[PDB]
């Protein structure tokens, strides 16, 4: 029915993100938003933050689609 | 040997020239900078709060690429598509006062001057500054 995606990081959500996102083999805003039940703009912000800390590898950048994946 | 404006990426050049004109800080910023739409076909105010420096950088570049442009030419350049309600869309020009204020601010910085046959055109010293910032773009991009 009506989705109730979180607008901001909860504590358990942030911890689960930080220790379960960096092993997915495919990192896009859509997959994190759908399987973490979060708003996609904050999904993009979280992915940008994980890229900023040097832990996730960007593959290609676009205005339409951005894709990341694991370092190793 | 010196790289020109026409020798680099235009978007990075425009952003670097915007940073240049922002750090100079001597353009006459209008009092209505945060309360206007840039054309009648817009739907919101510009999302980048210091849009004036970006617009002035792009204006300077456009005069470099083609001289003799007045206010009407720059309103033609930044014109877009008005969605007329439930009625078919059309091409609409930009706002004249914003283009005029950009041109007069660039004249106040002495980068841009009039000519005898028409509108505004580039000064030699502003053209030196523009070649300098273009070389900075090429060094920051093509040598990296």
């Amino acid at each position: 029915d009506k989705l109730n995606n979180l607008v901001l990081f909860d504590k358990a959500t942030y911890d689960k993100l930080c220790k379960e996102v960096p092993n997915y083999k495919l990192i896009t805003p859509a997959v994190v938003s759908e399987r973490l039940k979060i708003r996609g703009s904050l999904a993009r912000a979280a992915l940008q933050e994980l890229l900023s800390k040097g832990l996730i590898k960007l593959v290609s950048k676009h205005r339409a689609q951005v894709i990341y994946t694991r370092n190793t | 040997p010196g790289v020109t404006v026409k020798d680099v990426n235009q978007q990075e050049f425009v952003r670097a020239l915007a940073a240049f004109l922002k750090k100079s800080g001597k353009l006459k910023v209008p009092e209505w900078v945060d309360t206007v739409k840039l054309a009648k076909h817009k739907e919101l105010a510009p999302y980048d709060e210091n849009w004036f420096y970006t617009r002035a950088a792009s204006t300077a570049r456009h005069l470099y690429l083609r001289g003799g442009a007045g206010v009407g030419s720059m309103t033609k350049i930044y014109g877009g598509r008005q969605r007329n309600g439930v009625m078919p869309s059309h091409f609409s020009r930009g706002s004249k006062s914003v283009a005029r204020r950009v041109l007069q601010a660039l004249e106040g910085l002495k980068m841009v001057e009039k000519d005898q046959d028409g509108g505004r055109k580039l000064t030699p010293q502003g053209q030196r500054d523009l070649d300098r910032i273009a070389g900075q773009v090429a060094a920051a991009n093509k040598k990296h």
């Binding site: 083999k25 495919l26 896009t28 805003p29 859509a30 997959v31 938003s33 759908e34 996609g40 593959v59 290609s60 676009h62 339409a64 689609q65 894709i67 994946t69 | -």
Partner: protein, 189 residues
């Protein structure tokens, strides 16, 4: 070596089905840099068997009105689809593309005949050209009606449909519609 998007090779591409070697044109003469060619592959009959198959996907994603004529958007879509399918699967994207094409084309169709009131269905065979065409159409429809109102983009849904039809798992749209068509053909011999 000619490469799709500068990073995808067509030398290791092996086509499995004997039926379609002349009708899936991706080899050393059909290898192109980009799925855009401005080609007139439809001015004469059977010319579109010489069209490279990524150009056929690119030509078949320009559907439902708004997207007509927008081919650069579609070249972008299939490019991002190739990157994401390579990341998710770990091998050559073009290979599972031709795999999903082979596994998605129906082999036995039904035709509707009638005289007056009495309308019945007779099972008939399919041309290889129609096999490839229907596989392309069903995959494009699967991706398109797969996304349409969700957070997932068009490229992710296209790549997921392409994987799900490459391995032939029943969660794919194209293999479901193909199985339905083959079932009604078997019931209407």
């Amino acid at each position: 070596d000619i490469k799709l998007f500068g990073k995808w090779s067509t030398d290791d591409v092996q086509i499995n089905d004997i039926s379609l070697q002349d009708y899936i044109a991706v080899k050393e003469k059909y290898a192109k840099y980009l799925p855009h060619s401005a080609g007139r592959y439809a001015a004469k009959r059977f010319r579109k068997a010489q069209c490279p198959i990524v150009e056929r996907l690119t030509n078949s994603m320009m559907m439902h009105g708004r997207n007509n004529g927008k081919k650069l958007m579609t070249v972008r879509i299939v490019k991002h689809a190739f990157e994401i399918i390579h990341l998710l699967t770990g091998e050559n994207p073009l290979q599972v593309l031709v795999n999903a094409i082979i596994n998605s084309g129906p082999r036995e169709d039904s035709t509707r005949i009638g005289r007056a009131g009495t309308v019945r269905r007779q099972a008939v065979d399919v041309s290889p050209l129609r096999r490839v065409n229907q596989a392309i159409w069903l995959l494009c429809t699967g991706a398109r009606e797969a996304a349409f109102r969700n957070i997932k983009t068009i490229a992710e849904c296209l790549a997921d449909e392409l994987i799900n039809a490459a391995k032939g798992s029943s969660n794919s749209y194209a293999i479901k519609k193909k199985d339905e068509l083959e079932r009604v053909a078997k019931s209407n011999r």
